[PDB]
Ligand binder design. Structure first.
Ligand SMILES: [Cu+2]
Ligand SMILES: [Cu+2]
Ligand SMILES: [Cu+2]
Ligand SMILES: [Cu+2]
Length: 496
């Protein structure tokens, strides 16, 4: 594969992951987007060369390395108009950062408008030479990465504002209801061997309930966080989440369905939609004939715990933090609103405003969207689920950080002692009050928003401007980044 130093040539071409042809976004001349890897501590130099020419899907781009702390390298985070201006077509941009302190399953994607639904989205694995779960499996490589993704026959800005999927893609492949004969992804294992499978939702909207016929899974990693091993027989993964699970190829040499049921769209397995093949080495080149069985041991987030068992930042009791923020979801005028405001991209990026002058959140655009944080403090966020805002559960996500889910959806308990950590959490169904804590340790502007991309487009976002007075100091910016804005400004409507 590629990484940690690599050019990523972005362009357009035709694809048909489900037997239906359409123009999409290609990375290094391939759909789906190629896998990037490296080792813990590696300098990541990803030179994104933008050759896109198609206007419906946007000629401009920018790319976010999802779940990477980017201490010192805020200018490299990805979100357009928060951390940078978009890379303009016919140009290049170098993302230069280190992963000093992180290891696990990550992914990259366009953070320009709804552009990642059109194809610019791939996985990143940062292997750890001294991984604690290293001895739970014999195999961890290219062939153990499994992506889930919603595929739309109609492009992002062509179809409805919040459209429904035609198909689920597993590893780039899968079927719709008019293409029941398209190819199915095939994942091969050897009988006797154990696999660290890495699950990555590349979804724009749907969540998926993932399972495998005749196989239990041992989850050992959520997003990029090492977990205590937990055996489940199905995993509900929301947009942009990761789960790492070990699978034990101990069954009969055969074919087993890999199932990925979405909460919207075609909600069954007829014709092998939402399906894939787990093929034991030696079994026939044919569709499995296995039947599904109810999940008695479903993955329950509140029940996960980090390997190191670490406690949350703060004091084991509500408002036991230096600043607590409630986010009150809403939705009127087609626009989502958090606390009455509805995020729209500012003409000067949030990062340039801090580097140019702006000292406080009131001095920052867009107004009503930017919460200032203090340094080395314990933050607590709360995200009460509401019908007020349609399309739930909204999987909320926060850049520059990992956080402790003190309270998961579907639960009422507060876990201050050994909560699961991650970077993407479901806020749930009306009645839940998912709550997250973290410490400020990263001076810069960080995005916090629903990862259902069609919802972020309609404003479901706020900015954290964490530790502003030191933002300029710890985030030196490359000439090329300073040139992004002057370039994208001298651009007409369609050349964008
Ligand atoms: Cu992301
Ligand atoms: Cu992110
Ligand atoms: Cu949402
Ligand atoms: Cu984001």
């Amino acid at each position: 594969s590629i990484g940690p130093v690599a050019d990523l040539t972005i362009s357009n071409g035709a694809v048909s992951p489900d037997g239906f042809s359409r123009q999409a976004i290609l990375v290094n001349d391939v759909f789906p987007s190629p896998l990037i890897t490296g080792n813990k501590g590696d300098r990541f130099q990803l030179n994104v060369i933008d050759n896109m020419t198609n206007h419906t899907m946007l000629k401009s781009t920018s790319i976010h390395w999802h779940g990477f702390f980017q201490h010192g390298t805020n200018w490299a985070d990805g979100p357009a108009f928060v951390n940078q201006c978009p890379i303009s077509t016919g140009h290049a941009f170098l993302y230069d950062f280190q992963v000093p302190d992180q290891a696990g399953t990550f992914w990259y994607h366009s953070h320009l408008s709804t552009q990642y639904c059109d194809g610019l989205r791939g996985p990143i694995v940062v292997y750890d030479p001294q991984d604690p779960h290293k001895s739970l499996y014999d195999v961890d490589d290219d062939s153990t990465v499994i992506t889930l993704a919603d595929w739309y026959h109609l492009a992002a800005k062509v179809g409805p504002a919040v459209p429904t999927a035609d198909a689920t893609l597993i590893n780039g492949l899968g079927r719709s209801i008019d293409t029941l004969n398209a190819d199915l992804a095939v994942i091969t294992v050897t009988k006797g061997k154990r696999y660290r499978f890495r699950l990555v939702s590349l979804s724009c909207d749907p969540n998926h309930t993932f399972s495998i016929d005749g196989h239990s899974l041992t989850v050992i990693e959520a997003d990029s966080v090492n977990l205590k091993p937990q055996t489940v027989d199905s995993i509900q993964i929301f947009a942009a989440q990761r789960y790492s699970f070990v699978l034990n190829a101990d069954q009969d040499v055969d074919n087993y369905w890999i199932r990925a049921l979405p909460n919207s769209g075609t909600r069954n397995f007829d014709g092998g939609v939402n399906s894939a093949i787990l093929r034991y080495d030696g079994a026939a080149p044919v569709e499995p004939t296995t039947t599904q069985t109810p999940s008695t041991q479903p993955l329950v987030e509140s029940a996960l715990t980090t390997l190191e068992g670490t406690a949350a930042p703060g004091n084991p009791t509500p408002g036991g933090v230096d600043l607590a923020l409630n986010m009150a979801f809403g939705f009127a005028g087609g626009r989502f609103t958090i606390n009455g405001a509805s995020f729209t991209p500012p003409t000067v990026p949030v990062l340039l405003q801090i580097l140019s002058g702006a000292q406080s959140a009131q001095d920052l655009l867009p107004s009503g969207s930017v919460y200032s944080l203090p340094a080395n403090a314990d933050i607590e966020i709360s995200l009460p689920a509401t019908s007020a805002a349609p399309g739930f559960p909204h999987p909320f996500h926060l850049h520059g950080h990992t956080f402790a889910v003190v309270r998961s959806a579907g639960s009422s308990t507060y876990n201050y002692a050994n909560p699961v950590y991650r970077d993407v959490v479901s806020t749930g169904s009306p009645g839940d009050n998912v709550t997250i804590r973290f410490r400020t340790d990263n001076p810069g502007p960080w995005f916090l928003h629903c990862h259902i991309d069609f919802h972020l487009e309609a404003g479901f976002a706020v900015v954290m401007a964490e530790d502003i007075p030191e933002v300029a100091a710890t985030n030196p910016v490359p000439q090329a980044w300073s040139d992004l804005c002057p370039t994208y400004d001298a651009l007409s409507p369609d050349d964008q």
